């Protein structure tokens, strides 16, 4: 319960070599210094991608729970904190891409991936598997596409997963393919470069995903979609 | 320093409309009514243009430029030229659940309407003579 | 570098020579044979005789010849 | 003024920390969007101006009457301490004609110090003195 | 079940019991590779068993790349002979098989998103990190590499019997989640 | 446009390529490492431990064990406890 | 081309040894006599201790000893290997192919085993 | 201060601890000192 | 005191034999011959580094490779030198590479 010493107010507060006699020395544990510097990094990390405060509070709950249980001895405090921000995003029903978190933190994708694996193993915490519908509102509003295009994109993505047309592809690669059909078959056209830049998906990977989801296009689209562009007029990519 | 040398030159400021980021991370234009209801702050993103030039031996002065770097949010006065309600008709204001008779001129911070009272100071740059009788 | 590096090699040589049981003292040129310092300076030679082997508390002189000091150290 | 100075100070130490040991730095993650955002949201909300200089500048808008809302948006506040028993800056001076209301004034400890603009009062917004100085040196 | 895995690497530790000189071996070996800036050991390979060796100054011998336990021991005997040929007293102390990996197939596609849901406390499916499913089970201490194509790689055992018991428990589990 | 998702940062992969090309400092024999120990000592009388690793290019724990046999420490209250390269 | 590069080598050698010869007092008459001679010369076992049960596990060791065939003496930038092949980033180097001297600045090598 | 006395610290550092203990005792009784600084707790408010 | 890699060539052997004739005639000291070889090694290293601007390709099958002290000992069998102006066939090529 330490206090602090204010600025000097008179001649009795200053020593004769032009400095204050009483200095604001303050005690804090090296463990509390690590927690404070990690919490100050998490708020910096979360506000870069405009996360709400409740994700920050769940991240700080996850960081404090892991740090007192003390299973992650050697991995960097920024790496473990950036992994706890990833889990707390996913635990609130709105997960993020590893590339999205890696863009903010100094920590590489390989390192946060290893930290994410080790935290789940050392916390006995089960977290749900992501889908394609959870990455729909973020990836569509960033590209400036309307609501009906969003509804068409989230319908063809859910239909492709349920019909099981592309085993083993990451949900990122079928979400960006869902954006690509919904934008190319509407007024607001978006090229593979702008879609892949938001998705981090390579301009190779999005074609690799598009070469198998193409030939069953009219089955995926909803029955009440205003087709500004015909299905047979889509490019043969 | 510490040899390589770096210069971070700053440039034109870009300021956008007041936007709100949901839990999804999807940006949306913040309504003034939504800020009063959901206790939001009526702020707009502030984007700066930064040109970074590296100085190193070997005649390799590379000039890289980052477009519209996000450096935080600035609270926006209602009914100013940089607010969302600028240049809107009375019918369009009613459709936005905002009073047309509202004069504006106040910030919205945490959902509370905050007004800046004009502080009065002694005028600067001017020589003054007073009559201290003590 | 010069005049400040060869003294460490000399004192390391005669210490290891004393570790082999060589109690008998050695001359300056005899030490310089196996230390590969035959091209050493003459002004270094006079500086070693008047300063280096008399200020060191590990060197003692018998009839003009220098050796280790086992009496000062504990044996 | 100081908030951009505080941001530029911290981006300097962050870039220095990553160049002392030779990683170089990525500039977009060096600048945090936390200094300007908190500094302008803590101020205008708490009424504190710093980061003990000034206090009670930003007030909750008195949304009780449309006359009260307009009066609160056009309010002038004097820096004279209300525990001072002096009366020299509280009297209605002769030069408040036409731009400070002679009638509207709160009662009690604040009388004479909290003033309001008149109907036609327009506070100057400021301008660069370069065109005026260029005109004067061009003249005789 | 009727399907048995086949091994693809075997790693094992044995102790030579004597110190070794890395520089003397590196100038005088058939397949010497010695870069101290990269690693603290010399690798050497021979073509008939296709195995690789890691000799160390400590005398610890570790090998990899074998296809059988008898093949791995004979490869270690060949590797000890090469060390002993150059004047070193290479011996065999505490031979122990440390890890083997095996690859096999089930010949049907596997639904991974339903398998991770029912065994959430046993597996972890992260298609952003690695397209295969990691399945960390307790009884034989085996990690599994399950893919939508049906291939399964069995990894981490101390004997061949652990891998054989591993696929006997998982094949009914994979059979119930067939596409 | 900003904060675009990347697999790894440009400055990080440049540092990793430099670290993987330069490698670790190699362990060397005792007689050779003493030669640049004496050669550096002939140039300047005093040295910081933090600078010898950039001159002779050796592991810090190895350099700290070899030099402890011949060198000693003298306390200096002006900046830091500086190591001595003199055998005596 | 190749003889023209050889004469450029001759001019570089005789220019670089002028300061060496005058340093130790060696006269200039040695140098052109050296160049004349340089041109004329060119133009169930349970007891595991013994390992003698196997033999002929090595090939001929003479390939390093003869060195009769072509020898390539060059420099490398990066060498990498993956599953089958050794690839090389070789900078400038020299070799001797059947008496004729060849020269190169860059080379990509592919080999199998 | 008790730890520095039993560990035998230097004269300047034990004088600063006594001077700082001098300030903390006096601030507990009187925090309206004429020239000396006033104790605060993380927010700038003077301590009562 | 250099890389000492072009000494084991036909050019290096001819220069070494030439210096041996001068040594056997008691004309120059062997220390000068080492200095001549040292300056020759620096001269030939700068000659190949600057004036050589051509590229060659080669293929073959390797049998023996060794590595220690930044020295490679590649040995290739059945080597086919493929160049844009000439094709060279040779049974065996030894490669010595340093850095």
From Swiss-Prot, chain A:
Q: What are the start and end residues of every segment in region (Core promoter DNA-binding)? A: 110-114, 170-173, 204-207
Q: List the EC numbers from the record.
A: 2.3.1.48
Tagged with keyword Transferase = yes
Known post-translational modifications? Acetylated. Autoacetylated; autoacetylation at Lys-159 stimulates transcription activation.
GO cellular component terms, A-Z? cell division site; chromosome; germinal vesicle; kinetochore; nuclear body; nucleoplasm; nucleus; protein-DNA complex
Task: Indicate the impact reported for residue 117 to L.
Answer: Reduces interaction with VP16
Q: Where are the sequence repeats?
A: 45-121, 139-215
Where found, per UniProt?
A: Nucleus; Chromosome
Q: Show the segment(s) annotated as Necessary for TATA box-bound TBP complex formation.
A: 165-237
Q: Which GO terms describe its biological process?
A: DNA-templated transcription initiation; meiotic sister chromatid cohesion; positive regulation of core promoter binding; protein acetylation; RNA polymerase II core complex assembly; RNA polymerase II preinitiation complex assembly; spindle assembly; transcription by RNA polymerase II
Q: Which domain of life is it from?
A: Eukaryota
Phosphoserine: modified positions: 13
**Where is it chiefly localized?**
nucleus
- Top-tier EC class: transferase
Q: Which UniProt keywords apply?
A: Acetylation, Acyltransferase, Chromosome, DNA-binding, Host-virus interaction, Metal-binding, Nucleus, Phosphoprotein, Repeat, Transcription, Transcription regulation, Transferase, Zinc, Zinc-finger
GO molecular function terms listed in the Swiss-Prot or TrEMBL record: acetyltransferase activity; DNA-binding transcription factor binding; histone acetyltransferase activity; nuclear thyroid hormone receptor binding; promoter-specific chromatin binding; RNA polymerase II complex binding; RNA polymerase II core promoter sequence-specific DNA binding; RNA polymerase II general transcription initiation factor activity
Residues holding DNA: 73, 75, 110, 117, 169, 193, 202, 205, 207, 211
Q: Which family does it belong to?
A: Belongs to the TFIIB family.
UniProtKB/Swiss-Prot annotation, chain C:
Q: Which domain of life is it from?
A: Eukaryota
The region annotated as signal peptide is: none
Q: Which residues carry this modification: N6-acetyllysine?
A: 3
Where does the protein end up? Nucleus
Q: Where DNA binds (residue ranges)? A: 1-75
Write out the similarity annotation. Answer: Belongs to the TFIIE beta subunit family.
Subunit-structure text: Tetramer of two alpha and two beta chains. Interacts with FACT subunit SUPT16H. Interacts with ATF7IP. Interacts with SND1. Part of TBP-based Pol II pre-initiation complex (PIC), in which Pol II core assembles with general transcription factors and other specific initiation factors including GTF2E1, GTF2E2, GTF2F1, GTF2F2, TCEA1, ERCC2, ERCC3, GTF2H2, GTF2H3, GTF2H4, GTF2H5, GTF2A1, GTF2A2, GTF2B and TBP; this large multi-subunit PIC complex mediates DNA unwinding and targets Pol II core to the transcription start site where the first phosphodiester bond forms.
Q: Which disease is it linked to?
A: Trichothiodystrophy 6, non-photosensitive: A form of trichothiodystrophy, a disease characterized by sulfur-deficient brittle hair and multisystem variable abnormalities. The spectrum of clinical features varies from mild disease with only hair involvement to severe disease with cutaneous, neurologic and profound developmental defects. Ichthyosis, intellectual and developmental disabilities, decreased fertility, abnormal characteristics at birth, ocular abnormalities, short stature, and infections are common manifestations.
Protein name per the record: Transcription initiation factor IIE subunit beta
Species name? Homo sapiens (Human)
Give the gene name.
Answer: GTF2E2
Swiss-Prot record, chain F:
Return the GO cellular component terms, semicolon-separated: microtubule cytoskeleton; nucleoplasm; nucleus; transcription factor TFIIF complex
GO biological process: what's one of them?
A: positive regulation of transcription by RNA polymerase II
Q: Where in the cell is it found?
A: Nucleus
Q: Which first-to-last residue range defines the signal peptide?
A: none
Q: Which domain of life is it from?
A: Eukaryota
Q: Which UniProt keywords apply?
A: Acetylation, DNA-binding, Nucleus, Phosphoprotein, Transcription, Transcription regulation
Q: Where does DNA bind?
A: 77, 79
Does this UniProt record's set of keywords contain Coiled coil?
no
Q: Which GO terms describe its molecular function?
A: DNA binding; RNA polymerase II general transcription initiation factor activity
The answer to whether keyword Cytoplasm applies is no
Assembly and partners? Answer: Heterodimer of an alpha and a beta subunit. Interacts with HTATSF1 and GPBP1. Interacts with URI1. Interacts with GTF2B (via N-terminus); this interaction is inhibited in presence of GTF2F1.
Describe its function: TFIIF is a general transcription initiation factor that binds to RNA polymerase II and helps to recruit it to the initiation complex in collaboration with TFIIB.
Family membership noted in the UniProt record: Belongs to the TFIIF beta subunit family.
The name of this protein is General transcription factor IIF subunit 2
Q: What is the lineage of its organism?
A: Eukaryota, Metazoa, Chordata, Craniata, Vertebrata
Segment of the intact protein contained: 151 to 238 of 249
Swiss-Prot record, chain G:
* Residues annotated for DNA binding in this entry: 80-81
Effect on the protein upon substituting residue 58 to A? Strongly reduces phosphorylation. Eliminates phosphorylation
Which key words tag this protein in UniProt?
Acetylation, Nucleus, Phosphoprotein, Transcription, Transcription regulation
Compartments (UniProt record): Nucleus
Which SMART domains does its entry note? TFIIA (SM01371)
Positions of post-translational Phosphoserine modification: 53, 58
Q: Where does the protein principally reside?
A: nucleus
Q: Name one GO molecular function term.
A: TBP-class protein binding
One GO term (biological process):
RNA polymerase II preinitiation complex assembly
Q: Do the record's keywords include ATP-binding?
A: no
Q: Which GO terms describe its cellular component?
A: cytosol; nucleoplasm; nucleus; transcription factor TFIIA complex; transcription factor TFIID complex; transcription preinitiation complex
Q: Which family does it belong to?
A: Belongs to the TFIIA subunit 1 family.
- What protein is this chain from? Transcription initiation factor IIA subunit 1
Per the record, the gene is: GTF2A1
């Amino acid at each position: 319960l330490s206090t602090m010493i204010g600025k000097g107010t008179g001649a009795a507060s200053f020593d004769e070599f032009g400095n204050s006699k009483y200095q604001n020395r303050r005690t804090m544990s090296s463990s509390d210094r690590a927690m404070m510097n990690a919490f100050k990094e998490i708020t910096t990390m979360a506000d870069r991608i405009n996360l709400p405060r409740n994700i920050v509070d769940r991240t700080n709950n996850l960081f404090k729970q892991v740090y007192e249980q003390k299973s992650l001895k050697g991995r960097a405090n920024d790496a473990i904190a950036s992994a706890c921000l990833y889990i707390a995003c996913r635990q609130e029903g709105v997960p993020r891409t590893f590339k999205e978190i890696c863009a903010v933190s100094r920590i590489s994708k390989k390192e946060i991936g290893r930290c994410f694996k080790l935290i789940l193993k050392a916390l006995e915490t089960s977290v749900d598997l992501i889908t394609t519908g959870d990455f729909m509102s973020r990836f569509c509003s960033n590209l400036c596409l309307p609501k009906q295009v969003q509804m068409a994109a989230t319908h063809i993505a859910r239909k492709a997963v349920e019909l099981d047309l592309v085993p083993g592809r990451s949900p990122i690669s079928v979400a960006a393919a869902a954006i690509y059909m919904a934008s190319q078959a509407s007024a607001e056209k978006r090229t593979q470069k702008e879609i892949g830049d938001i998705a981090g998906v390579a301009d190779v990977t999005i074609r690799q995903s598009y070469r198998l989801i193409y030939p069953r296009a009219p089955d995926l689209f909803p029955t009440d979609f205003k087709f500004d562009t015909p299905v047979d007029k889509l490019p043969q990519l | 320093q510490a040899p390589p040398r770096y210069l971070l030159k700053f440039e034109q400021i870009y300021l956008s409309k007041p936007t709100h980021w949901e839990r999804d991370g999807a940006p949306s234009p913040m309504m003034p009514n939504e800020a009063r209801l959901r206790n939001l702050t009526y702020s707009a993103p502030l984007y700066v243009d930064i040109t970074k030039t590296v100085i190193k031996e070997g005649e390799e002065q590379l000039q890289t430029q980052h477009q519209k770097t996000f450096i935080g949010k600035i609270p926006i006065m209602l009914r100013s030229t940089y607010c969302l309600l600028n240049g809107l008709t009375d019918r369009d204001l009613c459709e936005l659940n905002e009073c047309p008779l509202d004069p504006g001129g106040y910030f919205i911070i945490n959902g509370s309407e905050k007004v800046l009272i004009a502080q009065e100071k002694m005028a600067t740059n001017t020589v003054y003579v007073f009559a201290k009788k003590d | 570098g010069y005049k400040f590096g060869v003294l460490a090699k000399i004192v390391n040589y005669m210490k290891t020579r004393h570790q082999r049981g060589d109690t008998h003292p050695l001359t300056l040129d005899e030490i310089l044979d196996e230390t590969q310092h035959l091209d050493i300076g003459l002004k270094q030679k006079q500086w070693l005789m008047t300063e280096a082997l008399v200020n060191n508390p590990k060197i003692e002189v018998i009839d003009g010849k220098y050796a280790f000091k086992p009496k000062y150290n504990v044996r | 003024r100081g908030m951009f100075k505080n941001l530029l100070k911290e981006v300097r130490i962050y870039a220095q920390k990553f160049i002392d040991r030779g990683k170089d730095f990525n500039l977009e993650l060096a600048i945090k969007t936390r200094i300007i955002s908190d500094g302008l949201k803590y101020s205008l909300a708490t009424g504190n101006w710093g980061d003990q200089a000034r206090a009670g500048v930003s007030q909750v808008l008195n949304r009780l009457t449309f006359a009260s809302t307009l009066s609160h948006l056009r309010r002038l506040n004097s820096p004279i301490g209300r525990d001072g028993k002096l009366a020299k800056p509280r009297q209605l001076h002769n030069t408040l004609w036409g731009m400070v209301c002679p009638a509207e004034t709160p009662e009690g400890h604040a009388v004479g110090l909290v003033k309001n603009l008149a109907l036609m009062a327009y506070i100057s917004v400021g301008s660069q003195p370069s065109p005026i100085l260029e005109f004067l040196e061009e003249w005789s | 079940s009727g399907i048995v895995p086949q091994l693809q690497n075997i790693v094992s530790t044995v102790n030579l019991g004597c110190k070794l000189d890395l520089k003397t071996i590196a100038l005088r070996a058939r397949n010497a590779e010695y870069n101290p800036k990269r690693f603290a050991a010399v690798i050497m390979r021979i073509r008939e068993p296709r195995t690789t060796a890691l000799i160390f100054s400590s005398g610890k011998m570790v090998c990899t790349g074998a296809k059988s336990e008898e093949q791995s021991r004979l490869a270690a005997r060949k590797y000890a002979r090469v060390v002993q040929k150059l004047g070193f007293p290479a011996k065999f102390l505490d031979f122990k098989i440390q890890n083997m990996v095996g690859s096999c197939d089930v010949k049907f596609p596997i639904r991974l998103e339903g398998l991770v849901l029912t065994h959430q406390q046993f597996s972890s499916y992260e298609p952003e990190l690695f397209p295969g499913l990691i399945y960390r089970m307790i009884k034989p201490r085996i990690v599994l590499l399950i893919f939508v194509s049906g291939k399964v790689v069995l990894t981490g055992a101390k004997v061949r019997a652990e891998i054989y018991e591993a696929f006997e428990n998982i094949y009914p589990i994979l059979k119930g989640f067939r596409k | 446009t900003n904060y675009k998702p990347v697999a790894n940062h440009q400055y990080n992969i440049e540092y990793e390529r430099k670290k993987k090309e330069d490698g670790k400092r190699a362990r060397a024999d005792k007689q050779h490492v003493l030669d640049m120990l004496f050669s550096a000592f002939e140039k300047h009388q005093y040295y910081n431990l933090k600078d010898l690793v950039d001159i002779t290019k050796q592991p810090v724990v190895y350099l700290k064990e070899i030099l402890k046999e011949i060198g000693v420490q003298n306390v200096k209250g002006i900046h830091k406890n500086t190591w001595e390269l003199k055998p005596e | 081309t190749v003889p023209k590069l050889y004469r450029s080598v001759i001019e570089d050698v005789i220019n670089d040894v002028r300061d060496i010869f005058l340093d130790d007092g060696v006269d200039e008459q040695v140098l052109m006599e050296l160049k004349t001679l340089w041109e004329n010369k060119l133009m169930g076992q349970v007891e595991e201790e013994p390992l003698n049960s196997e033999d002929d596990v090595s090939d001929e060791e003479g390939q390093e000893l003869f060195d009769t065939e072509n020898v390539v003496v060059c420099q490398y930038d990066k060498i990498h290997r993956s599953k089958n092949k050794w690839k090389f980033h070789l900078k400038d180097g020299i070799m001797n192919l059947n008496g004729r001297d060849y020269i190169f600045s860059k080379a990509i090598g592919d080999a199998e085993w | 201060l008790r730890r520095n006395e039993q560990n035998g610290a230097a004269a300047h550092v034990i004088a600063e601890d006594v001077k700082l203990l001098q300030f903390h005792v006096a601030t507990m009784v009187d925090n309206e000192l004429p020239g000396l600084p006033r104790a605060m707790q993380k927010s700038g408010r003077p301590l009562k | 005191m250099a890389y000492q890699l072009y000494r084991n060539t036909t050019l290096g052997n001819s220069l070494q034999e030439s210096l041996d004739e001068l040594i056997q005639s008691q004309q120059i000291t062997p220390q000068l011959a080492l200095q001549v070889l040292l300056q020759f090694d620096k001269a030939i290293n700068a000659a190949l580094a600057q004036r050589v601007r051509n590229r060659v390709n080669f293929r073959g099958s390797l049998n023996t490779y060794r590595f220690c002290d930044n020295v490679w000992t590649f040995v290739l069998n059945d080597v086919e030198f493929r160049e844009v102006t000439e094709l060279i066939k040779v049974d065996k090529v030894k490669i010595v590479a340093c850095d």
